[PDB]
Design an enzyme around this catalytic site. Structure first.
Site, PDB file in Angstrom:
ATOM      1  N   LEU A  64     -28.972  -8.520 -11.058  1.00 51.42           N
ATOM      2  CA  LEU A  64     -28.327  -7.531 -10.196  1.00 51.42           C
ATOM      3  C   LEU A  64     -29.302  -6.767  -9.304  1.00 51.42           C
ATOM      4  O   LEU A  64     -28.885  -6.220  -8.276  1.00 51.42           O
ATOM      5  CB  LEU A  64     -27.531  -6.515 -11.023  1.00 51.42           C
ATOM      6  CG  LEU A  64     -26.314  -7.001 -11.810  1.00 51.42           C
ATOM      7  CD1 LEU A  64     -25.476  -7.928 -10.943  1.00 51.42           C
ATOM      8  CD2 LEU A  64     -26.717  -7.663 -13.093  1.00 51.42           C
ATOM      9  N   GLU A  70     -31.782  -8.056  -7.554  1.00 51.19           N
ATOM     10  CA  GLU A  70     -32.095  -8.790  -6.332  1.00 51.19           C
ATOM     11  C   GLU A  70     -31.025  -8.597  -5.264  1.00 51.19           C
ATOM     12  O   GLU A  70     -31.326  -8.702  -4.072  1.00 51.19           O
ATOM     13  CB  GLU A  70     -32.284 -10.272  -6.631  1.00 51.19           C
ATOM     14  CG  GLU A  70     -33.571 -10.588  -7.336  1.00 51.19           C
ATOM     15  CD  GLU A  70     -33.949 -12.045  -7.211  1.00 51.19           C
ATOM     16  OE1 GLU A  70     -33.245 -12.776  -6.472  1.00 51.19           O
ATOM     17  OE2 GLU A  70     -34.963 -12.449  -7.838  1.00 51.19           O
ATOM     18  N   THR A  95       0.854  -1.212   0.000  1.00 48.26           N
ATOM     19  CA  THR A  95       0.000   0.000   0.000  1.00 48.26           C
ATOM     20  C   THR A  95       0.877   1.245   0.000  1.00 48.26           C
ATOM     21  O   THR A  95       1.910   1.229   0.662  1.00 48.26           O
ATOM     22  CB  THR A  95      -0.883   0.105   1.244  1.00 48.26           C
ATOM     23  OG1 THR A  95      -0.073  -0.167   2.385  1.00 48.26           O
ATOM     24  CG2 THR A  95      -2.063  -0.839   1.206  1.00 48.26           C
TER      25      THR A  95
HETATM   26  N1  GTP Z   1      -6.112  -8.221  -3.603  1.00 50.46           N
HETATM   27  C1  GTP Z   1      -5.337  -7.522  -4.442  1.00 50.46           C
HETATM   28  N2  GTP Z   1      -5.014  -6.266  -4.148  1.00 50.46           N
HETATM   29  C2  GTP Z   1      -4.229  -5.710  -5.100  1.00 50.46           C
HETATM   30  C3  GTP Z   1      -3.764  -6.279  -6.263  1.00 50.46           C
HETATM   31  N3  GTP Z   1      -2.984  -5.377  -6.971  1.00 50.46           N
HETATM   32  C4  GTP Z   1      -2.994  -4.295  -6.232  1.00 50.46           C
HETATM   33  N4  GTP Z   1      -3.728  -4.432  -5.084  1.00 50.46           N
HETATM   34  C5  GTP Z   1      -3.946  -3.422  -4.059  1.00 50.46           C
HETATM   35  O1  GTP Z   1      -4.498  -2.287  -4.684  1.00 50.46           O
HETATM   36  C6  GTP Z   1      -3.822  -1.085  -4.243  1.00 50.46           C
HETATM   37  C7  GTP Z   1      -3.040  -0.513  -5.398  1.00 50.46           C
HETATM   38  O2  GTP Z   1      -3.921  -0.343  -6.533  1.00 50.46           O
HETATM   39  P1  GTP Z   1      -3.373  -0.725  -7.986  1.00 50.46           P
HETATM   40  O3  GTP Z   1      -4.354  -1.613  -8.666  1.00 50.46           O
HETATM   41  O4  GTP Z   1      -1.958  -1.180  -7.884  1.00 50.46           O
HETATM   42  O5  GTP Z   1      -3.400   0.702  -8.701  1.00 50.46           O
HETATM   43  P2  GTP Z   1      -3.806   1.168 -10.173  1.00 50.46           P
HETATM   44  O6  GTP Z   1      -5.277   1.035 -10.324  1.00 50.46           O
HETATM   45  O7  GTP Z   1      -2.900   0.516 -11.158  1.00 50.46           O
HETATM   46  O8  GTP Z   1      -3.435   2.720 -10.102  1.00 50.46           O
HETATM   47  P3  GTP Z   1      -2.112   3.501 -10.565  1.00 50.46           P
HETATM   48  O9  GTP Z   1      -1.045   2.458 -10.591  1.00 50.46           O
HETATM   49  O10 GTP Z   1      -1.863   4.562  -9.540  1.00 50.46           O
HETATM   50  O11 GTP Z   1      -2.412   4.060 -11.921  1.00 50.46           O
HETATM   51  C8  GTP Z   1      -3.005  -1.517  -3.023  1.00 50.46           C
HETATM   52  O12 GTP Z   1      -3.773  -1.423  -1.832  1.00 50.46           O
HETATM   53  C9  GTP Z   1      -2.671  -2.971  -3.358  1.00 50.46           C
HETATM   54  O13 GTP Z   1      -2.418  -3.736  -2.201  1.00 50.46           O
HETATM   55  C10 GTP Z   1      -4.113  -7.617  -6.569  1.00 50.46           C
HETATM   56  O14 GTP Z   1      -3.794  -8.286  -7.557  1.00 50.46           O
HETATM   57  N5  GTP Z   1      -4.920  -8.169  -5.576  1.00 50.46           N
HETATM   58  C1  LOC Z   2      10.957   3.124  -8.140  1.00 48.75           C
HETATM   59  O1  LOC Z   2      11.289   2.725  -6.816  1.00 48.75           O
HETATM   60  C2  LOC Z   2      10.381   3.003  -5.834  1.00 48.75           C
HETATM   61  C3  LOC Z   2       9.105   3.481  -6.054  1.00 48.75           C
HETATM   62  C4  LOC Z   2       8.243   3.745  -4.995  1.00 48.75           C
HETATM   63  C5  LOC Z   2       8.679   3.515  -3.685  1.00 48.75           C
HETATM   64  C6  LOC Z   2       9.979   3.022  -3.467  1.00 48.75           C
HETATM   65  O2  LOC Z   2      10.404   2.797  -2.174  1.00 48.75           O
HETATM   66  C7  LOC Z   2      10.455   1.424  -1.803  1.00 48.75           C
HETATM   67  C8  LOC Z   2      10.821   2.770  -4.531  1.00 48.75           C
HETATM   68  O3  LOC Z   2      12.092   2.297  -4.301  1.00 48.75           O
HETATM   69  C9  LOC Z   2      13.048   3.309  -4.012  1.00 48.75           C
HETATM   70  C10 LOC Z   2       7.780   3.787  -2.562  1.00 48.75           C
HETATM   71  C11 LOC Z   2       8.312   4.336  -1.370  1.00 48.75           C
HETATM   72  C12 LOC Z   2       7.730   5.194  -0.460  1.00 48.75           C
HETATM   73  C13 LOC Z   2       6.408   5.251  -0.043  1.00 48.75           C
HETATM   74  O4  LOC Z   2       6.136   6.015   1.053  1.00 48.75           O
HETATM   75  C14 LOC Z   2       6.936   5.790   2.219  1.00 48.75           C
HETATM   76  C15 LOC Z   2       5.267   4.587  -0.659  1.00 48.75           C
HETATM   77  O5  LOC Z   2       4.249   4.493   0.019  1.00 48.75           O
HETATM   78  C16 LOC Z   2       5.312   4.056  -2.032  1.00 48.75           C
HETATM   79  C17 LOC Z   2       6.361   3.480  -2.718  1.00 48.75           C
HETATM   80  C18 LOC Z   2       6.022   2.463  -3.781  1.00 48.75           C
HETATM   81  N1  LOC Z   2       4.882   1.650  -3.398  1.00 48.75           N
HETATM   82  C19 LOC Z   2       4.996   0.655  -2.517  1.00 48.75           C
HETATM   83  C20 LOC Z   2       3.721   0.055  -2.020  1.00 48.75           C
HETATM   84  O6  LOC Z   2       6.092   0.256  -2.135  1.00 48.75           O
HETATM   85  C21 LOC Z   2       5.785   3.179  -5.106  1.00 48.75           C
HETATM   86  C22 LOC Z   2       6.846   4.259  -5.274  1.00 48.75           C
END
Ligand code: GTP
Ligand code: LOC
Ligand code: GTP
Ligand code: LOC
Ligand code: GDP
Ligand code: GDP
Ligand code: CA
Ligand code: CA
Ligand code: MG
Ligand code: MG
Ligand code: MG
Ligand code: MG
Lengths: 423, 439, 440, 421
Positions: free
Chosen positions: B252, B254, B179
């Protein structure tokens, strides 16, 4: 495809820049001639981020080399991987900037900037989906400091929505070339606080200390300092260069790491500091948060962490990784802000860098970084109060009003950082 | 015969979507190339599975589905996957660069440019329909696309398909599972924007599915694949009434008649049992009374909350497999006087029951053991308001300092939309307090 | 690129010029006929030594230098000497009548007859340059040509090359050597005229060089040949950064940034070590620690003043020879605790260090012992204003009675020019006081 | 290229003039036939200062002999080194001067100045780069006194930026020729104060005493006095004629010797008459002054000292420093480092080592006082004025010379008492 254009300017910018390519070229199995000779497809899956593919399974760094003097240019072109760089992308002048920010930003640099932009513009047209730019440079000289910041402004003018990412080396009296480095650095910090989205502060003082006090090296060279810089640079870009659960780019990185726009200066860290004995995951996380491993001379305990990102590389127990991270947090929760929930993220990567069984890389956004700017600012004022050495600048067209502005803007930065430390 | 079009938005919906259609295929006997020997009417027919699949002159069955993500990296894995030949190429809509976990960027900046293209691709599917009942939207709360582009899509669907029903499968964010820090922002922003364009929404809390994979399946570090296979079991239980012959939840509307008596409170809680590890070579299969009794253990809910300190407005038991009505009445008799089942006083204290004799199908090589009987319980409980309260608090903590707001304002959003959405959520919690508690 | 044109003006400048070029040749392996067998690039090249030597088709290496004097007798020796084949005749320019120790005659009466010709020869040299860096101007304070003509040449050069940098190696007069009674006048006169046209000046006090040649070299009565050979070693250390390439070598324009806090404060104090004789060098082997310490002894300074009674604004150590950083640093830490290095409060208290690997040379038949490692310290210290004061007092003693002023007015000068020059010197002394006062 | 044009006028003028060429020809290796017969290359380096180079390595003095009476140059062309002199450069009159300044300056001498001028001009066109002129004459009366000062004034109008240098012999009654000598001296000092750059005051009074008391000569002759004059003239011109470590000409000497324009009258000295300590000591002693003035009755403005012969530079430096410290009181403070010393390798004829002294001392006012005393004694009573008024002069011109000489003495006092702070 998330392509990154790399620009390296000045002496320091090119020496650390050049080592960066040597290290990542190795990790991806590219030899000095640009031919792939690795053993895993993982090495080629994100290869298009930093390398442009030439005909003949040849890979060419998407890198631009800039300097106002021809020396270091020739130095790289004959170094180990000098042949791997595209000849068209060596843009250099003849006059040199004489460690003078004004020369690099206004007079001598101006004559060469358009030449660099034509190469920048050329490498960008060649990108399916440009992600952003990254720049290596020192802040205390002239070409890196002044021309660098000049390029960053010209690039933001033509690419207003791409990401601007710099590795910026801060000056220190322990490793000094001239006395005007606080001047050159304060003028540049001003520019960086306005036109970059992410800046890694790589503090030469910290580098010096790590070498001297930890590695036990009485007489450190720029080559020893750069060894640490390339290790760090490799680790910070891991998620960009290798596959993993983490589908992220530089923009996603900035959105989560930068809570307020002006506070985008990152504290880098690396472990283990460069071994037969293998490190333990408890040990890697222990050191990563230790003050002695930060590449910026700031005691994290003097301030609070806004955002933290850690990257573990190696074949290791992801569970143990996670356990140790929650320990530290629960062991230092007085050093994290409570108003940004879950602000410490971890990524793991299976490919370990050449030489180590496994390693950690620390990327922190912390209010303690104000100590770095306070230091720069203290040394600036000592000289400026008496207008020492100003003539090297006022003789290039600059006025004192411009020094007063940079200094003021920097103190505000320190104030902003300290406003969020008492939250 | 009425059709249902599914829409998968963002990385979470596309993968969860991949998993469901893999399961739908195994359940209806459809091959990975769209062939179906079970089906005797070639190129058509009004069977119950035709609500999710259309047919071609070549005897191929195609999901009535559309995959949209603002970057190609996740859909490409579907374009080169095991069911690559099952999807028409135009069903897969990918963009150039994503929303960077930024609700504003997905809804306003990148969304504006790709919305019309998506709606055309959807239209193309609605035209092939002779009685579309509506849409099932799969998306995350936290993604910039899942949160931002979805709420724009839900807004448009209400215009172009007014009378139709929109149901939502949402992934609530949990820090145990990848997340970003700004995900609380995107969650409130999308919940407020979409709250009036969704007739019924099933939340899945990644925290819950995570623990279930750890406890019941003995997976040390569950992966997206583990999580999505367990999710698509729950989803498959909810949609089977639409795909199979039956009498309960046949369309949908129901879901809303049986589960949603108040419009804003349209968030049912899914519990599911039994989750059994396939690595357990032997494991006595539970009775009907036992699987029914598990529906009231917090451990087996799709959202961690305590239904004992809430009130029910509707319960619906959906059994799959070897279940006789006689045994169901027996359990229900017992679970009434055993457990704490408070019903709101303006609602009958009862249970709508469904039985589908075909037992749960398991992805071969999956984590789940095959079971002779399983149940899924959809209850509308004020207990779920806990998940809103946790989320809203995290929102409060960051918004008080204005942290990360500049990224949203920078895409064109007004800072005031934060306060509007939050004020709506502050009302949503109150709607639960007035419905549930007493003096 | 980065090419330096060296101008030697008048006897002192010409005779210092001979010493220097003889030494450069010995340092680079250039023969008296200009052939450099080690140089593989025939007719050109962009090597470090090329900043001071051009090349011809025949493989001759010609100094980027002009010698100018208002009478021939001193240049005539260069014309008929050992390195006669080194210079082109057009580089050696002489008149018929000198300035008679009269600044007014070198800057006006005689000088105007020949200035144009000198500037033409300089231009020709500058056109052979791919990136003229600046000029090095060798002259005395006390002669009519050294003071008068030099000032004229500097003024003209600012007009033809703008702010292109100009460095002076000046000879400060001393009674022991060979000084005229009017030399304090020519000194204050030229110092005032050139002040705004000089980016940096290295004064060599003849009394300091004379005392060093006696104490350290065991020379009863040093001659000009004795003094110049020592002067040229200092000149060689300062330019060594321009003529030699090296991993740890620092360019002189980088020291120049740390050695000039303000435009008028551009007079560094030079010290050199070791100045030992072969008799004494046979026994002692002098370490980096010893030669470094020796730079902080008042008696080893090219200008007679007491740095303990001033404050430092910059300290540059220029090492050449068998020297490595580990020892330099160890040495500086010792000095940093046993000595009174008091710095001004407005600039860091560091030491800037360059290291040239090429070891010191000595001319055959010289008085200096051959050593494995030398150091030259360039420090900027308020202490150096003592030289201004001493020279200003002699000026005042005579000028209070207008003694000899009629010689200058007879050639066209006005008493006003005297008092103007003096008042400038007055400000200059006050400028040194203020940089030393502590900040608010 | 630093040529000097030598001019000798009058009996005394040509006499000491002839000796000067005898001595310096001997030092440079020039025989009476002008052929070089020396053995050192130092003798020919600065030869062109006083000699022209004729066909076949023949060196000719660059001198011009002038007199209003043939009875003297007749002698000059008979003495040794009389053929060496270029025969055109003889410019002799016939009537004579009769020890009458006015006849030499206004009447007789004027009839002949055009003739000498053409010779001085012809000798000057010959010079690569003319330094200036040197005149040996006599303030005693007639040709050298009155005509000599006319030549100085005429040459000056055509070579105004050149150096005018005189060796001027002052009258004394112990060697007296005429009674009217005080009159002639004062009229000349009036000219020299205005038209010369540097003047050596060779005083017949001092020369008489040196011969008598020091050299113990009962009946001194002009031969004996002139022998002193030669030794001094050889000395003061040493660094003009040889390539010493000093690189200087007449103008550089003037610039360092003459602090104010009128005070350009020098006191020569010579030693011996033997170590560095005694040689230096005698040199600052009154008994060695070629002028009847006690260095200790006034103060040195500037001093130059030339040592010739083989000796240690260091001892010279030390001995010259000790003399100054032990006589500090007798040097003005307002001219720092006002004593300069040269050393030449080759010694004079017949001496292991000599030392010459050139002082600019306020004590010289004693010389002038002496002449002023004798002048004012005659003029007061109007004795002999008809000799002069009969040629066209008026008493006015006699008064100016006196009042101008009074001031000259008055200046020398002003600076003697001047103090510093
Ligand atoms: N259960 C489940 N959660 C997922 C999955 N992929 C991502 N998530 C959750 O969804 C959130 C991230 O949303 P994503 O689907 O990665 O984001 P997106 O819609 O691609 O949006 P952007 O990347 O910002 O354009 C986080 O809370 C993840 O833990 C999956 O395959 N399964
Ligand atoms: C392209 O490489 C990186 C890119 C990101 C992150 C990151 O740190 C592990 C990276 O490595 C240096 C990243 C880090 C910080 C965050 O906040 C502390 C966050 O929530 C979000 C993140 C990343 N998301 C997650 C769930 O790790 C997305 C952006
Ligand atoms: N160190 C050193 N000082 C010298 C040398 N030659 C002259 N000097 C000093 O320089 C001053 C005189 O300047 P010179 O160079 O002789 O004069 P110039 O420039 O020829 O001037 P004029 O001949 O008067 O036109 C005195 O203080 C001398 O001691 C020399 O070779 N070395
Ligand atoms: C042509 O020969 C001479 C020329 C000069 C000088 C001199 O006396 C030693 C000479 O010999 C007679 C001379 C004398 C007097 C000085 O001090 C008053 C002086 O400063 C200056 C000098 C000379 N300078 C020096 C350094 O001796 C230059 C002029
Ligand atoms: N870490 C590191 N710092 C360097 C290096 N080279 C120079 N610096 C530092 O950078 C500053 C000088 O900038 P430099 O790159 O030499 O100047 P430029 O060429 O004008 O950009 C000083 O603070 C140096 O200590 C290098 O290779 N590594
Ligand atoms: N030392 C010296 N003095 C002389 C000589 N001849 C004349 N005098 C002096 O010069 C003065 C007369 O000048 P003189 O040359 O005889 O007359 P002029 O030829 O008319 O100028 C007297 O004081 C004489 O003593 C001589 O040969 N030697
Ligand atoms: Ca069919
Ligand atoms: Ca060459
Ligand atoms: Mg540098
Ligand atoms: Mg995505
Ligand atoms: Mg000269
Ligand atoms: Mg007579």
């Amino acid at each position: 495809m998330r392509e990154i254009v790399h620009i390296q300017a000045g002496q320091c910018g090119n020496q650390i820049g050049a080592k960066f390519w040597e290290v990542i070229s190795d990790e991806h199995g590219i030899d000095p001639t640009g031919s792939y000779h690795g053993d895993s497809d993982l090495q080629l899956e994100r290869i298009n981020v930093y390398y442009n593919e030439a005909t003949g399974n040849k890979y060419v760094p998407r890198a631009i080399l800039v300097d106002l003097e021809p020396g270091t240019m020739d130095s790289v072109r004959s170094g180990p991987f000098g042949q791997i760089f595209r000849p068209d992308n060596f843009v250099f002048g003849q006059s040199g900037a004489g460690n003078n920010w004004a020369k690099g930003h206004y007079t001598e640099g101006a004559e060469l900037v358009d030449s660099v932009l034509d190469v920048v513009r050329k490498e960008s047209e060649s990108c399916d989906c440009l992600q952003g730019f990254q720049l290596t440079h020192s802040l205390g000289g002239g070409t890196g400091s002044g021309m660098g910041t000049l390029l960053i402004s010209k690039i933001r003018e033509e690419y207003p929505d791409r990401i601007m990412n710099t590795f910026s080396v801060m000056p220190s009296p322990k490793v000094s070339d001239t006395v005007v480095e606080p001047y050159n650095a304060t003028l540049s910090v001003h520019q960086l606080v306005e036109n970059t989205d992410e800046t890694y502060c790589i503090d030469n003082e910290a580098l010096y200390d790590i070498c001297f006090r930890t590695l036990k090296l009485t007489t450190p060279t720029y080559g020893d300092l750069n060894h640490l810089v390339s290790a760090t640079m490799s680790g910070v870009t891991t998620c960009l260069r290798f596959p993993g659960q983490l589908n992220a780019d530089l923009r996603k990185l900035a959105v989560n790491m930068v809570p307020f726009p002006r506070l985008h200066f990152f504290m880098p860290g690396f472990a283990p500091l460069t071994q037969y004995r293998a490190l333990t995951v408890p040990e890697l996380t222990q050191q990563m948060f230790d003050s002695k491993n930060m590449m910026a001379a700031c005691d994290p305990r003097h301030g609070r962490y806004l955002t933290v990102a850690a990257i573990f590389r190696g074949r290791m127990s992801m569970k143990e990784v996670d356990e140790q991270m929650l320990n530290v947090q629960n062991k230092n929760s007085s050093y994290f802000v409570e108003w940004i929930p879950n602000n410490v993220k971890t990524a793991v990567c299976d490919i370990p860098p050449r030489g180590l069984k496994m390693s950690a890389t620390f990327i922190g956004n912390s209010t303690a970084i104000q100590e770095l700017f306070k230091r720069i600012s203290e040394q600036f004022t000592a000289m400026f109060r008496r207008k020492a050495f100003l003539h090297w600048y006022t003789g290039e067209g600059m006025d004192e009003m411009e020094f007063t502005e940079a200094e003021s803007n920097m103190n505000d930065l320190v104030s902003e950082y300290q406003q969020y430390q008492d939250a | 015969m009425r059709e249902c079009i599914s829409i998968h938005v963002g990385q979470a919906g596309v993968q969860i979507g991949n998993a469901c259609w893999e399961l739908y295929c195994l359940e209806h006997g459809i091959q990975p190339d769209g062939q179906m020997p079970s089906d005797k009417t070639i190129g058509g027919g009004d069977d119950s599975f035709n609500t999710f699949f259309s047919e071609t002159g070549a005897g191929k069955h195609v999901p009535r589905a559309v995959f949209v993500d603002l970057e190609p990296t996740v859909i490409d894995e579907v374009r080169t996957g095991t069911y690559r030949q099952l999807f028409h190429p135009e069903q897969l809509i990918t963009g150039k660069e994503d929303a960077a976990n930024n609700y504003a960027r997905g809804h306003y900046t990148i969304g504006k440019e790709i919305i019309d293209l998506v709606l055309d691709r959807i239209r193309k599917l609605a035209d092939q329909c002779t009685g579309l009942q509506g849409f099932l939207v799969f998306h995350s709360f936290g993604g910039g696309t899942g949160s931002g582009f979805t709420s724009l899509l839900m807004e448009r669907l209400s215009v172009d398909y007014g009378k139709k029903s929109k149901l939502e499968f949402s992934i609530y964010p949990a820090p145990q599972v990848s997340t970003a820090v700004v995900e609380p922002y995107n969650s409130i922003l999308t919940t407020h924007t979409t709250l009036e364009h969704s007739d019924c929404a099933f939340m899945v809390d990644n925290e819950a599915i995570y623990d279930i994979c750890r406890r019941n399946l003995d997976i040390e570090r569950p992966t997206y694949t583990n999580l999505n296979r367990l999710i698509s079991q729950i989803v498959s239980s909810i949609t089977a009434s639409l795909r199979f012959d039956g009498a309960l939840n046949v369309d949908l509307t129901e879901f809303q008649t049986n589960l949603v008596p108040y419009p804003r409170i349209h968030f049912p809680l899914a519990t599911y049992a039994p989750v059994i590890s396939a690595e357990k070579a032997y494991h006595e299969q539970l009775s009907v009374a036992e699987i029914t009794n598990a529906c009231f253990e917090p451990a087996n809910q799709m959202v961690k909350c305590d239904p004992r300190h809430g009130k029910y407005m509707a319960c619906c038991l959906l059994y799959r497999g070897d279940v006789v009505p006689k045994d169901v009445n027996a359990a229900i008799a017992t679970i009434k006087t055993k457990r704490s089942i408070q019903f709101v006083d303006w609602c009958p204290t009862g249970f709508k029951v469904g039985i589908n004799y075909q037992p749960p199908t398991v992805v071969p090589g999956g984590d789940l053991a095959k079971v002779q009987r399983a149940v899924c319980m959809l209850s509308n409980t004020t207990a779920i308001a806990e998940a809103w309260a946790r989320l809203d608090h995290k929102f409060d903590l960051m918004y008080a300092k204005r942290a990360f707001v500049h990224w949203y304002v920078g895409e064109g959003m007004e800072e005031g939309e934060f306060s509007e959405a939050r004020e709506d959520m502050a009302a949503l919690e109150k709607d639960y307090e007035e419905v549930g508690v007493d003096s």
